Amino acid sequence: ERMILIRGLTRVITFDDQERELEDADILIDGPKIVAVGKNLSDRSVSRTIDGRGMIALPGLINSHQHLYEGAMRAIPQLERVTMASWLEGVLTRSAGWWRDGKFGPDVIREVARAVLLESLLGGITTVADQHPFFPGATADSYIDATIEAATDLGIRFHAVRSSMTLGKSEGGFCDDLFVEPVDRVVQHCLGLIDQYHEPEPFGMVRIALGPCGVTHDKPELFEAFAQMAADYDVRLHTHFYEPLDAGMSDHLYGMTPWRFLEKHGWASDRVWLAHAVVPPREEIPEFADAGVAIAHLIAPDLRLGWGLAPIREYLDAGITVGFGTTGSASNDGGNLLGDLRLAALAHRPADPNEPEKWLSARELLRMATRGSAECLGRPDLGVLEEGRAADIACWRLDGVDRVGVHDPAIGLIMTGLSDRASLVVVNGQVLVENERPVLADLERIVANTTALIPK
Ligand SMILES: [Zn+2]
């Protein structure tokens, strides 16, 4: 029950209400929470002191959109250069083929999730929201049990987002029977996950969310169902939003825009955060803001699939909450959140070539990846380095040869480096990474183990 001190951090970016940063400053930790943040803190009831000299400290990075099972589908030649239609077809084909061959059961997904989630810690990420849409079995399998087990083993903070594809071919589905479950089955299963796994109190380490694949992949009945369950059980809602093909297929299926659909079926609320949001009509943006929905920027896939640049500046001008994510490793193909910020830093600029003020800055992006994502997930206890918040902390060394000459360390973190490896990482007050190595997890064993279970 004794405390931890991180002394002499070169720089501490807090993302509190003032955007306070501190130099040569400390973080005092008591169990799961941050006791204090400032210069020269007392080491009185302290049982361990850690030298932060030459490090920048940020709140733990929070990846607000993952598909862990896709770590098994990395760098596939046939999928290197495909449009979404071929990509989606190729992923489902593979996951389906592997499953019924017996090579893709929960025990496999568990070890795939273990590796990617460990990669996540190693990249400064302390919270991950995974969206798992793949439930064949006919009793809904224990895939989410499997990812929760991996996360819990490793000590990373975790949001399981129960996903699906309830709208089949005969209903206008571009999906498959195998993966089409009845709404009630999806609803019943979610109820059980909440009762069993959901930790609604401050500093909760596992939380359940409800997440249809999308407005054109799921029955409107599921959206209304989840909207009731979210109010009743006080959990959050998640889905994909304004992918380029959506506004076309939504209108074909419902004669309305995806936003209008969400609004009808109870999802224009502050319990909702939304993935990608690449191509909305501009007139709806002020409606996103009044409704209090959050959005997650996912640059690597939006680029990987040819989709382009989501109007992130417009969301920020509108006062909409923006978070950040990597999406799955079949369209990234990494879980490197930090590296992905450099992508967003650079690729937005050609769209406003003469208005650099519009361009996203390093500090806006880091905010997205911490406090922005915290608010996507409805975690007022995360994403900020201040007393009373969770002791979720990620630190990077600034004294490498690849970062000589850096004038601002926050900007340098995005714009320079041969490596995005974090040095020190603290989740829930537990040191899980030190000297860029896992302190509790066995890295080599995990790598050999997971590698042996990857389907050919
Ligand atoms: Zn996704």
DSSP three-state, residue 411: helix
1-59+384-438 topology per CATH: Urease, subunit C; domain 1 (2.30.40)
How far is the centre of ligand 1, averaged over its atoms, from the C-alpha of 273 (Å)?
A: 12
Element at 228 (helix H, strand E):
helix 220-233
Say whether 297 counts as a known binding-site residue. Answer: no
How far is the centre of ligand 1, averaged over its atoms, from the C-alpha of 275 (Å)?
A: 7
Which strand ranges, in their side-by-side order, compose the sheet holding 294-297? 61-66, 125-132, 157-164, 206-212, 236-241, 272-276, 294-297, 322-324
Say whether 65 counts as a known binding-site residue. Answer: yes
C-alpha to C-alpha distance for 429 and 6, rounded to whole angstroms: 11
Q: Contact 61/18 with Cβ under 8 angstroms?
A: no
DSSP three-state, residue 278: coil
Find, among 205, 163, 1, the residue nearest to 68 by Cα.
163
Beta-bridged to residue 316, according to DSSP, are none
C-alpha to C-alpha distance for 271 and 368, rounded to whole angstroms: 18
Find, among 425, 380, 384, 366, the residue nearest to 203 by Cα.
380
Domain boundaries, the chain: 1-59+384-438, 60-383
C-alpha to C-alpha distance for 413 and 397, rounded to whole angstroms: 9
C-alpha to C-alpha distance for 131 and 64, rounded to whole angstroms: 10
User: Strand 236-241 and strand 206-212: pairing?
Assistant: parallel
DSSP 60: P
Distances (CA, A) of 364 to 72, 128, 183: 32, 20, 39
What's the sign of the alpha-carbon dihedral 294, 297, 302, 308? Answer: positive
Distance, C-alpha 363 to centroid of its chain: 18
Q: Experimental method for this entry?
A: X-ray
Distance, C-alpha 174 to centroid of its chain: 26
How far is the centre of ligand 1, averaged over its atoms, from the C-alpha of 393 (Å)?
A: 26
Find, among 96, 47, 45, 95, the residue nearest to 71 by Cα.
95
How far is the centre of ligand 1, averaged over its atoms, from the C-alpha of 405 (Å)?
A: 38
User: Strand 393-397 and strand 424-427: pairing?
Assistant: antiparallel
- Pseudo-torsion of CA 125, 128, 133, 138, nearest 10°? 120
DSSP three-state, residue 371: helix
DSSP of 132-145? E----TTTT-SHHH
Find, among 405, 403, 387, 396, the residue nearest to 433 by Cα.
396
Find, among 98, 164, 161, 86, the residue nearest to 129 by Cα.
161
DSSP three-state, residue 135: coil
C-alpha to C-alpha distance for 210 and 235, rounded to whole angstroms: 8
How far is the centre of ligand 1, averaged over its atoms, from the C-alpha of 426 (Å)?
A: 27
Distances (CA, A) of 327 to 131, 200, 437: 9, 25, 24
C-alpha to C-alpha distance for 445 and 189, rounded to whole angstroms: 33
Q: Which residues contact 107 (CB under 8 A, 6 or more apart)?
A: 146, 453
DSSP 38: E
Give residue for tokens 């760098």.
75
Give residue for tokens 């990482």.
425
Q: Contact 167/216 with Cβ under 8 angstroms?
A: yes
Find, among 55, 61, 40, the residue nearest to 9 by Cα.
55
Biggest distance spanned by C-alpha atoms of the chain: 68
Beta-bridged to residue 30, according to DSSP, are 33
Element at 49 (helix H, strand E):
strand 46-51
Residue 330 in tokens: 């079949």
Give residue for tokens 């995990």.
446
Q: Which residues contact 437 (CB under 8 A, 6 or more apart)?
A: 443
How far is the centre of ligand 1, averaged over its atoms, from the C-alpha of 240 (Å)?
A: 7
DSSP 126: E
Region class of 288: left (phi > 0), else alpha (psi between -120 and 50), else beta = alpha
How far is the centre of ligand 1, averaged over its atoms, from the C-alpha of 132 (Å)?
A: 9
Say whether 238 counts as a known binding-site residue. Answer: no
How far is the centre of ligand 1, averaged over its atoms, from the C-alpha of 388 (Å)?
A: 32
60-383: CATH class: alpha beta
How far is the centre of ligand 1, averaged over its atoms, from the C-alpha of 71 (Å)?
A: 13
How far is the centre of ligand 1, averaged over its atoms, from the C-alpha of 327 (Å)?
A: 5
